[PDB]
């Protein structure tokens, strides 16, 4: 069977129920609340289509090659994917995106991390030296 998903824009997606129920949130709205279509006020059409594509392909240990290519997006889009995976309760998608952010942090100096994420250093000289002394 197919279930209609309704994005925050209003665009409706026809998705197989087995793919839709990878979202625990959508599964609850189907099984416990008996809702058709499934409104998703927190997910726009662009991210929802991206999420459906990920869910169909994963009908995940660490990050495979397909997921790395799937996550070759800007940090704003990666942020929106984390939010959608949280809102929809897709543990697999939340794990791969969070591991991806950690991979952008590891093996870098603090200044290299700042440059990666466009972060301004707001420590005072005394505070930074103290944090540096304690590690």
């Amino acid at each position: 069977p197919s279930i209609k998903l309704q994005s925050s824009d209003g665009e409706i997606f026809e998705v197989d129920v087995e793919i839709a129920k990878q979202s625990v949130t959508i599964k609850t709205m189907l099984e416990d609340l008996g809702m058709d279509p499934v409104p998703l006020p927190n997910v726009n059409a662009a991210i929802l289509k991206k999420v459906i594509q990920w869910c169909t392909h994963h009908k995940p240990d660490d990050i495979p090659v397909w997921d790395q290519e799937f996550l070759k997006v800007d940090q704003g889009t990666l942020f929106e994917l984390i939010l959608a995976a949280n809102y929809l309760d897709i543990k697999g998608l939340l794990d791969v995106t969070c591991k991806t952010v950690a991979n952008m942090i590891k093996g870098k100096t603090p200044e290299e991390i700042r440059k990666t994420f466009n972060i301004k250093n707001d420590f005072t000289e005394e505070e930074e030296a103290q944090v540096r002394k304690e590690n």
């Binding site: 940090q75 704003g76 984390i82 950690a102 942090i105 100096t109 700042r114 466009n118 944090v131 590690n135």
Partner: protein
């Protein structure tokens, strides 16, 4: 879509602190230090998130070395005190690992010696230990259980009419094999004899059990595979034949049963079907000892050598030379091989180096340990210690943590 985004500030700002904490939980220690110095909010997320406590907990969960030191040093008391305590504790644990690894490499150790005080026939053929006790099988036909801390004898189990040659225990039973050709099952708590298996025609030289099944092997050149529904309900499943001499040792997992014999061969059997798989040739004399886990088989032989094998293709990956007499017992973990010989000597080998075909042979034996005055019959070890037993009627505890 924004080009860049401060995930670690943005997530707590919207009430999703745990997601930001989960991202940082993937970091190694040095990257966690780097994250601390990114900006004030990144520091607050790691601190309010107790990231250093979580890093130490993840290590305790995934590394027996960290797990063992948490118990032995007592800082595991605080796991599962502010964040700064765990940040300051982490380097103390690191240097504590490095002092232990240095002690293994240099053989700095303390020594405890149990005199088993055998009245007539001296010698300790087999042993297994935990943090509470050492269970030992003796040439005087008894099993003696020693307190790991006080070294005193807490229980003597009698019933065998010959030497206790092999043993293993879990949380419910001790199982022993003997020169009297029987296998016996004992209550590990009370010592009560629960079952006796009459089957082998000659001495039961080795046994292993796990997850409801047991393999026994004998001087009668056979292996017996048993199904254990309970300590009192043990059924013979299959008899494996094919060895042309005494079967001195047997080990197994869910994939394979591995046996080795005076006939100079190791034989591989399918655990599920008990069908023969392959013969490992290479040792020039009989094989006295063996351990198998994952894909690795390690064997010791009367030819004075140790051989490493891959179970799937049967290839010998490395020959270890150095022992001056028969290699009588051998164990390995993720880091080391520890072997004992007929000349009373114990050798520690670098397993990672031994599995690298580029490493030279002279760099493989880390140390030789000489404190037994007779043949070394059995040993077991972990990250911190070796426990060994000998024909000299002693059990030694070599402790590499000071």
């Amino acid at each position: 879509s924004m080009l860049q985004r401060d995930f670690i500030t943005a997530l707590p700002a919207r009430g999703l602190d745990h997601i930001a904490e989960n991202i940082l939980s993937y970091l190694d220690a040095k990257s966690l230090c780097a994250a601390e110095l990114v900006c004030k909010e990144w520091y607050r997320v790691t601190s309010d998130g107790m990231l250093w406590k979580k890093l130490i907990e993840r290590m305790v969960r995934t590394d027996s070395l960290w797990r063992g030191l948490a118990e032995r040093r007592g800082w595991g008391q605080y796991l599962f005190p502010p964040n700064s305590f765990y940040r300051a504790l982490y380097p103390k644990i690191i240097q504590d690992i490095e002092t232990i690894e240095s002690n293994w490499r240099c053989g700095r150790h303390s020594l405890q010696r149990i005199h088993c005080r055998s009245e007539t026939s001296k010698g300790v053929y087999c042993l297994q230990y935990d943090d509470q006790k050492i269970v030992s099988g003796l040439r005087d036909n008894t099993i003696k259980i020693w307190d790991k801390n006080t070294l005193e004898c807490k229980r003597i189990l009698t019933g065998h009419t010959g030497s206790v040659l092999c043993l293993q225990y879990d949380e419910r039973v001790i199982i022993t094999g003997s020169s009297d050709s029987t296998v016996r099952v004992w209550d590990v708590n009370t010592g009560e004899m629960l079952n006796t298996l009459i089957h082998h025609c000659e001495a039961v030289l080795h046994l292993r059990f796990n997850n409801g099944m047991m393999v026994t092997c004998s001087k009668d050149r056979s292996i017996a595979v048993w199904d254990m529904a309970s300590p009192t309900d043990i059924t013979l499943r299959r008899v494996l034949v094919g060895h042309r001499a005494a079967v001195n040792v047997v080990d197994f997992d869910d994939k394979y049963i591995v046996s080795a014999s005076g006939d100079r061969t190791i034989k591989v059997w399918n655990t599920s079907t008990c069908e023969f798989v392959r013969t490992l040739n290479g040792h020039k004399r009989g094989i006295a000892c063996l351990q198998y886990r994952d894909r690795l088989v390690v064997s010791g032989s009367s030819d004075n050598t140790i051989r490493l094998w891959d179970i799937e293709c049967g290839a010998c990956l490395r020959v270890l030379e150095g022992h001056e007499e028969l290699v009588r017992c051998i164990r390995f973990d993720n880091k080391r091989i520890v072997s004992g010989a007929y000349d009373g000597k114990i050798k520690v080998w670098d397993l990672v180096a031994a599995l690298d075909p580029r490493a030279p042979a002279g760099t493989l034996c880390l140390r030789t340990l000489v404190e037994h005055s007779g043949r070394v019959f059995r040993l077991q070890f972990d990250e911190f210690q070796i426990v060994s037993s000998s024909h000299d009627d002693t059990i030694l505890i070599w402790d590499f943590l000071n």
